[PDB]
């Protein structure tokens, strides 16, 4: 049977974790704000000519429950760490997610992609240069996305699969 | 200021489950109480009648009140789209507490939740404005149709609602 990959989408409230995931799974943009509790999705795709089953966990960006994230970080195989290019706080929050995943998995070596989302917006508050450096500091890719236009969406998820595939 | 009483008649897939009544603490949060009272009577020409409990998480709470979008994103107050947090005098002390849902500070609309346990981490963030008077067993029965992430396994509706006192 096709290989499964357990992907986990994390980041601050409202950065567009759900809009990215639903663009990938359902090919439409959620314009409304439905803050997540926790959702899972399954999708079969072909990446680099190998079929695989994506299990995607869309997590809550509620800072109140930062302690509840450990259990899903233990089970996840790869992480999309998402910030919004118009939310410098969400970009600051990337460090915390990265450090929590590293701590919970007890490893420097966890498949991860840094995602800068909402790149359709006219104004950015985060310097693409800063995100590039941070990703370089972590040894992970950085992908710019728009869940609105679908720009970079497949690239973000498929790049994370390639990161897991290389780790395996 | 006297605390009014309102009721919901709850249905499961269009079948009657039973009645929940609420004391609204108009004596502590009159603005928040009056919003819920008027949405329960429908006297402004809109309100809770026909809306669903979109989120039911057993061991925590039952959330509803989106009568504008019916998808968990909507709802509105009798004062406009949103109103301020009136105060946090009342706390989430245990089952039956009735409290305002929100999307952060001063974003009260119509969405509300009924606690089925103490949720003290919501203290100072959500405005408590009432408590179940009769039919806590109906709120417990609503947990039959909930899940870990709150998606309901049957459609839980406010088939009727109004004021008793
Ligand atoms: C981390 C998982 N997880 C948990 C949670 C947490 C815990 N704990 C926390 C506390 N620990 C004690 C100190 C020791 C024990 C373990 C255990 N297990 C769980 C669940 C079952 O694991 C999946 C929660 C929870 C809550 C959210 C996101 C994830 C959450 C969340 C997202 S949005 C929101 N919260 C506020 C929301 N806003 C809107 O809906 C906005 C929509 C848009 O604009 C109008 C409308 C709102 O107002 N309410 C009205 C109020 C109850 C609230 N929803 C809600 O649903 O809380 C769910 C729940 C279960 C109570 C909390
Ligand atoms: N312009 C624009 N808006 C976006 C984009 N992605 C998401 N949004 C908008 O930002 C808001 C929040 O998106 P959402 O996917 O719910 O974010 P989230 O990170 O899942 N939130 P949460 O942590 O609460 O679950 C929505 O109104 C959504 O339409 C994007 O790429 N561009
Ligand atoms: Mg989300």
Residue numbers in the entry:
A (entry chain A): 0 to 167
B (entry chain D): 1 to 165
What is the paper's account of this structure, in its own sentences?
Here we describe RMC-7977, a reversible, tri-complex RAS inhibitor with broad-spectrum activity for the active state of both mutant and wild-type KRAS, NRAS and HRAS variants (a RAS(ON) multi-selective inhibitor). The binary CYPA–compound complex then binds to active RAS (with dissociation constant Kd2) to form a tri-complex structure in which CYPA sterically occludes RAS–effector interactions.
All residues in the binding site are identical among HRAS, KRAS and NRAS, and RMC-7977 is equipotent across these RAS isoforms. Kd2 measurements for all three wild-type RAS proteins were approximately 100 nM (KRAS Kd2 = 116 nM, NRAS Kd2 =  101 nM and HRAS Kd2 = 94.7 nM). RMC-7977 exhibited similar activity for wild-type and mutant RAS variants in biochemical assays, and in the live-cell nano-BRET assay the cellular potency for inhibition of CRAF (RBD) binding to wild-type KRAS was only modestly lower than that for the oncogenic variants.
